[PDB]
Structure 1
Amino acid sequence: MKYIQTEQQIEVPEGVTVSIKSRIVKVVGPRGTLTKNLKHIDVTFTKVNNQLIKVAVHNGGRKHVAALRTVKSLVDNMITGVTKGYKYKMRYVYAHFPINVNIVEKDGAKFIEVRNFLGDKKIRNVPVRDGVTIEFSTNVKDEIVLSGNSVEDVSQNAADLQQICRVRNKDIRKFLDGIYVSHKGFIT
């Protein structure tokens, strides 16, 4: 109904500095730096102090106001990405054929290969996005860990690995074989 003013608050830790200009957001923390372009929402950022930043929408409808809370979540994710980081864990699930997962290098591109998925002779390759590191956890059988500063880069990288191992022409309720995300958390 064209609300006069809607407001959200963003908190900043001690070691994190935020620079916003022309809807370009750069967050610098102990773990690195992140940059995001937000020139598609028409919001107004204002600084209260070194520990608080407010973002507001003026004369906005229901749909416009709904995007204001999204901005806060995206900026908050950047802040914790450069402070605590993100760690995604996945597990290998299979019935008969073991799944062999290894990291390979192809023309300096840092791919990851999946072998012997349901006995397939085909080799499945998934690119590893920049800023995402892949390690194989010890003392836990068939687990792969993805870490990085950007939650979107880590989440999408893990999602690509899950979709590359989908079963075709079979009852998926019976053939529960694949690699699935099992835990979402922070590196620290």
Structure 2
Amino acid sequence: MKYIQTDQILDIPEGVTVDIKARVVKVTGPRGELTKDLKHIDVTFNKINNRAIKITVHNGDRKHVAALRTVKSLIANLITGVTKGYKYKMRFVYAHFPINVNIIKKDGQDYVEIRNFLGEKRVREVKIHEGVTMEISSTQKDELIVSGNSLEAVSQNAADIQQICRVRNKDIRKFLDGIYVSERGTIVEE
């Protein structure tokens, strides 16, 4: 239908300074700065005030309009990453074989080392992405805390850890072993 114009309104909290130039968004907050390039999308930005930003698509078709609220949501996630942080909690699920999880450092790189998963002699290593913090929960047995400013990196490292623990050649309805994301929240509780 080629909608003539479609708009979304970003909301900037008091301590956050978004900064946009040539579709390169740099969001600054109390917790730090995050940057993202959006050169793969045709959008335009207008600063309504210091607390609001208009995001506009002119004469956009259905898919190109669909790509507008995703831009809004990504920048909002950047804003809440530098003002609240992100925290994913993972629970270790096993029926028989305890999962031995350590945070090791090899070749100057941080890794998550999973051992004895379903009794295997194999040692699983997951690279920890930059800007992502791992911690073994003390308050909970068999719990890993993945935290950081960027939601994308945190959720993708968590997914890496979950995916490396997939069960093969078994009835996965019965063999429910693995490492699963149990809680998706923020560093600053709300």
In which range does the TM-score fall when normalised by the shorter chain? over 0.9
Q: How many pairs does the alignment contain?
A: 188
In the TM superposition, what is the alpha-carbon distance from 1:140 to its structure 2 partner?
1.1
Within 5 Å, which residues of 2 pair with 1:147-162?
147-162=147-162
CA distance in structure 2 between the aligned counterparts of 1:7 and 1:160, rounded to whole angstroms: 35
Does 2:105 match 1:105? yes
Deviations 1:135-154 (A, max 9, x none): 11122111101000000000
Percent of counterpart pairs with the same letter? 72
User: Equivalent residue for 1:146?
Assistant: 146
Q: Which residue of 1 aligns with 2:169?
A: 169
Inter-partner Cα distance in structure 1 for 2:106 and 2:141: 27
2:86 alignment counterpart: 86
The two structures have a TM-score, normalised by structure 2, of: 0.98
User: Gapped runs of 5+ residues in structure 1?
Assistant: none
Structure 1 moving runs of 4+ over 3 Å: none
- Letter of the 1:79 counterpart: I
Amino acid at match of 1:167: V
Whole-Å Cα distance in 1 between the matches of residues 40 and 99 of structure 2? Answer: 43
2:137 maps to 137
Q: Secondary structure at the match of 2:169?
A: coil
- Corresponding residue number in structure 2 for 1:8: 8
Identify the residue that residue 183 of structure 1 maps to in structure 2.
Answer: 183
Unaligned runs of 5+ in 2: none
Taking the aligned partners of 1:139 and 1:88, their CA distance within structure 2 comes to: 15
TM superposition score normalised by structure 1: 0.99
RMSD between aligned alpha carbons? Answer: 0.5
Task: Work out whether 1:70 is the aligned partner of 2:70.
Answer: yes
1:52-104 deviation line (CA, Å, top 9, x unaligned):
00000011111110000100000000000000000000000001110000011
Please state how far the C-alpha of 1:175 moved relative to its aligned partner: 0.5
